[PDB]
Structure 1
Amino acid sequence: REIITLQLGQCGNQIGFEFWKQLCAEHGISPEGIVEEFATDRKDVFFYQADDEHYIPRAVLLDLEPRVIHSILNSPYAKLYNPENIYLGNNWASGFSQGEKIHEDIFDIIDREADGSDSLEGFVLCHSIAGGTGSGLGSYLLERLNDRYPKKLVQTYSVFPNQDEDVVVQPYNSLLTLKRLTQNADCVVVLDNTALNRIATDRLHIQNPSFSQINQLVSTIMSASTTTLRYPGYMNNDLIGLIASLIPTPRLHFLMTGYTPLTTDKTTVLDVMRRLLQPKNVMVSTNHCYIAILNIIQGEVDPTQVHKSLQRIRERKLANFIPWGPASIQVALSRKSPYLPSAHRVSGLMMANHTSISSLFERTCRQYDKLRKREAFLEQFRKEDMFKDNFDEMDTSREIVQQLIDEYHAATRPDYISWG
């Protein structure tokens, strides 16, 4: 129905501003919020409807120590948005404590959009794990979110902070954030900073202005993930019906994303399907087996051959698969978006559940362990000491991620009738 997005932290506000600029480029609209005279699509998914039909984006402008927000302020896209969502440390505990003391006014802004909106479907978070500004604040707000509304949805977009390795408490901060992320979020879009770094170096010669370029990649990802909702199709025109298929159990809600374009500066489905199924076309990094795989294709394609395509990949047996109850490769087709320059129309997308991400979690689990065992990487912070005198939150997050990795490995087994 009506979906409100949320953005917090400087990096989260950056990717949100890039996303709304990217949809201003995508749709036939002006940077005033005014529709053009040659413009179709649905604008009730993320556009709060003003009374000039200023399609104001449903995102709440959350920050701490605003620096890039001043750059957001002086922009010709600051007249595209601003429903008055703007707001006045680099650690988890300080952001947590400062978040709890100002929680009432941000919840007032939340209630302002939410009662201001027609209906409600879900809250989609733009987040960076261990971002300093994002961490602590976002975890507290996620606790507030599900406690306030158990009838609503909460999806998160979260990056995995690994820039080839300085903040040395970043394992602990990430543990607290993913602990809240597993038990207090309904669907997780996990992004790998290293894999996107490798592709960004691959397509270009860049290593230093990396944020701007991966912002392009990720905004293509978020636009693609909601394109079937924004555009008149037939399935997954709602968030929840889109989310419900991939998740077999409410701790496995972690989403690997795939995308056939890498250097983006006739065609048919059977090519790009087997192209996409190879994991170097996947921009996220014993035996691992996919739990469920879903594909959506947008471009210049004949839809009548796709069953023969599907027939081939059934004869491929190209992914080994999970030995319990039935999953398939899950195909959808969407319209290519008008009102924008459309070169190389054909682009595919893979939303899939894979077990290999647990190994990435194990990397943080290893790192946290050695730093915890050195007695040398908390550095005696007053917020951390005053909020928690016994330091048991690390223990709670550790047993949670241990139970989760055990759930991963037991789902890998042919028996998941046993406990995880």
Structure 2
Amino acid sequence: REIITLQLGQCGNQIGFEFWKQLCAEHGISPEGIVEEFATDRKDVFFYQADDEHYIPRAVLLDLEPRVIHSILNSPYAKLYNPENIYLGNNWASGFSQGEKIHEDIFDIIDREADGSDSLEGFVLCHSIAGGTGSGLGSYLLERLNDRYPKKLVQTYSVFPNQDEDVVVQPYNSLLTLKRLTQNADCVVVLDNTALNRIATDRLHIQNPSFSQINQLVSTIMSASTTTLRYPGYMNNDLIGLIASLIPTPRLHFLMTGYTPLTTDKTTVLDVMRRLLQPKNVMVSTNHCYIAILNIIQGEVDPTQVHKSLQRIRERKLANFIPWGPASIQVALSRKSPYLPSAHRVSGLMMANHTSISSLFERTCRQYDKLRKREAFLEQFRKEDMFKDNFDEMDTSREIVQQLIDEYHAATRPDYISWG
């Protein structure tokens, strides 16, 4: 019923610490984990039922060679949580082998927290790709969660590892990780470092401190995606009911991200609807078409004019679509986030299955094919050779992602009645 949250990798632990500081700010709770008189919300989603009726969040921290985890530890939000779920090489095979050798005690920590909760609903993975040891270890951990719990749901918050150029084995890492994400995950929420960097240089003139502000954007997106569960609404107060609508088939299960405010330093519903449809507002970077779109809206918004707006967007005919299937845009509304003062109160978020992500996948495949034909940028490791002697695992993952590209472009067609 309760979801166990994991932060994995070094950069993933950074954005997880940002997200838990964000939850300390969002709910009416102290940095010691203490429920206050300024806290009525739901606390059975990410909060471990800690013992003094103080709903302490679940921050399962798994890592090897911790450096930024120490700076996370010397913080007043390490008194918000510590049920001892914190635990103490830039290639995929190295992190894979590191996850393989110490699987048992970290899986004992996982079973420990799973028995600690009243029940289980899913494992959400808070990660940033290309964190060094985080990649590879993340795919192995994803395989362990998928193998051990085939009746639960796994969500993957992931960035697209592209800063437009150092790790040159990064296309290999993302290629193998994407093969594992196709088969060991039920839904993956993908963000783009390129589009987030472009939007950050769009809103202000920051290029040096941009990473910390992108962490704030990621934390707010993560809060907005789970506000409908953490605060009592009527729909998408469960994970699976939210996930089931957007995914037609378990290989096309990657969702783009968008967010209506650009700066954070009345607004009617028609504005935010066609605002969220524009690709300037999508934080993810030929014919390409959405499969299904769903939006959450949380702010000073009248729930009656949304049918007038949706009528206007319908007769506008503003997006094309996958033109053989009964899919629609799906309008959903949740509560404005309480117990903290927020500027720019109206903020909406979209998760949509778009075949445009196959273009970036094909870009990564083209980069992988170029570096593979050259073969001077695998940076040859003993981990990489020992994990696979003939290096056919990247070719098998290439076959998987080629099948994915074919399925994407067949879904782009009006004929996907048979699989292609």
Report the TM range for the smaller structure's normalisation: over 0.9
Residue-by-residue CA offset, 1:176-211 (whole Å, 9 max, x unaligned) = 111101111110000000000011112222112222
How many Å separate the matches in 1 of 2:385 and 2:25?
47
Structure 1 outlier segments of 4+, above 6 Å: none
- For the aligned residue pairs, the C-alpha RMSD in angstroms reads 1.0
> Could you tell which deviates more after superposition, 82-91 or 101-110?
82-91
SS in 2 for 1:136: helix
- Structure 1 residue 380 displacement after superposition: 2.4
Moved more, 289-298 or 299-308: 299-308
How many Å separate the matches in 1 of 2:26 and 2:281?
A: 24
CA contact (8 A) 2:7 2:125 kept: yes
Residues 11-64 of structure 1: per-residue CA shift (max 9 Å, x gap): 000000000000100011111111222332101100001121232211211112
CA contact (8 A) 1:129 1:177 kept: no
d(CA) in 2 for partners of 1:304, 1:263: 27
CA distance in 2, matches of 1:94, 1:39: 44
Cα deviation for residue 129 of structure 1 reads: 2.3
Which residue of structure 1 lines up, in the alignment, with residue 13 of structure 2? 13
Cα offset, 1:342, TM superposition: 2.2
Q: Deviations over 1:186-238 (max 9, x none)?
A: 10000000000011112222112222100110111111111111111111110
Against the structure 1 CA distance between its residues 70 and 360, is the aligned structure 2 distance closer, same or farther, given a 3 Å change threshold? same
Instruction: Give yes or no for contact 1:54–1:80 (8 Å, CA) kept in 2.
Output: no
Which residue matches 1:224?
A: 224
| Separation in 2, partners of 1:205, 1:198 | 11
Partner Cα separation in structure 1 for residue 250 and residue 205 of structure 2: 41
Measured in 1, the distance between the counterparts of 2:73 and 2:380 equals: 36
2:4/2:122 contact within 8 Å kept: yes
Asked if the contact 1:276–1:282 (Cα under 8 Å) also holds between the matched residues in 2, the reply is yes
> SS at the partner of 1:303?
coil
In terms of mean alpha carbon deviation, does 16-25 or 80-89 score higher?
80-89
Counterpart contact for 1:64–1:89, Cα < 8 Å: no
Aligned equivalents of 2:349, 2:2: Cα separation in 1: 24
- 8 Å Cα contact 2:261/2:344 also seen in 1: no
**Residue 134 of structure 2 aligns to a residue in which SS?**
coil
TM-score (norm 1): 0.98
Contact 2:96 2:136 in 1 (8 A): yes
The alpha carbon displacement at 1:243 in A equals: 0.1
| 1:148 to partner: Cα distance | 0.6
Gaps of 5+ in 2: none
Structure 1 residue matching 2:77: 3-state secondary structure: coil
For each residue in 1:367-395, what CA deviation from the matched residue of structure 2 results, as whole angstroms up to 9, or x when unmatched? 11011101212232111111111111111
Measured in 2, the distance between the counterparts of 1:31 and 1:38 equals: 14
Distance 1:128 1:38 in 2: 33
1:126-147 deviation line (CA, Å, top 9, x unaligned):
1222321211111111111111
2:59–2:86: 8 Å Cα contact kept in structure 1?
Answer: no
Cα offset, 1:323, TM superposition: 1.5
Query: Offset at 1:272?
Result: 1.1
* 8 Å contact kept, 1:42–1:231: yes
CA distance in 2, matches of 1:373, 1:230: 49
How far 1:260 sits from its partner (Å)? 0.6
* Cα distance in 1, alignment partners of residues 169 and 38 from structure 2: 53
Q: Distance in 2 between matches of 1:271 and 1:213?
A: 25
1:306 and 1:129 map into 2 onto residues whose CA distance is 37
Equivalent-residue separation in structure 1 for 2:185 and 2:210 (angstroms) = 29
Give the TM-score of the pair, scaled to structure 2. Answer: 0.98
Question: How many angstroms apart in 1 are the aligned matches of 2:136 and 2:77?
Answer: 29
3-state DSSP of counterpart to 2:157:
strand
Secondary structure in 2 aligned to 1:135? helix
Match of 2:263, SS state, is coil
Q: Structure 1 residues 39 and 381, CA, compared in 2 at 3 Å: closer, same or farther?
A: closer
Given that 2:90 and 2:167 are in contact with CA atoms closer than 8 Å, whether structure 1 keeps it comes out as no
Summarize the alignment of residues 107-146 of structure 1 with structure 2, pairs less than 5 Å apart. Answer: 107-146=107-146
**Aligned equivalents of 2:400, 2:340: Cα separation in 1:** 45
The alpha carbon displacement at 1:262 in A equals: 1.2
Determine the C-alpha separation between the residues in 1 that align with 2:211 and 2:67.
Answer: 16
For residues 112-135 of structure 1, the C-alpha deviation after alignment (integer angstroms, 9 at most, x for no partner) is 110110111100001222321211
Any conservation in 1 of the 2:294–2:350 contact (CA below 8 Å)?
yes
Query: 2: CA distance between counterparts of 1:134 and 1:204?
Result: 30
Asked if the contact 2:129–2:159 (Cα under 8 Å) also holds between the matched residues in 1, the reply is: yes
Asked if structure 2 preserves the Cα contact closer than 8 Å seen for 1:33 and 1:53, the reply is no
How far apart in 2 are the matches of 1:174 and 1:37? 46
Q: Residues 213 and 312 from structure 1, CA distance in 2 versus in 1: closer, same or farther, beyond 3 angstroms?
A: same
> Counterpart of 2:279?
279
Whether the aligned pair in 1 keeps the contact of 2:265 and 2:343 (CA below 8 Å) is no
User: Structure 1, residues 261-310: CA drift from partner, whole Å, max 9, x if none?
Assistant: 11112122111111211111111111111100101111112212221111
Alignment partner of 1:241: what SS?
Answer: helix
CA distance in 1, matches of 2:129, 2:17: 18
Is 2:294–2:352's contact at 8 Å kept on the other side of the alignment? yes
CA deviation string 1:238-267 (max 9, x = no partner): 000000000000111100111111111212
SS at match of 2:323: coil
| Structure 2 SS opposite 1:144 | helix
SS in 1 for 2:257: strand
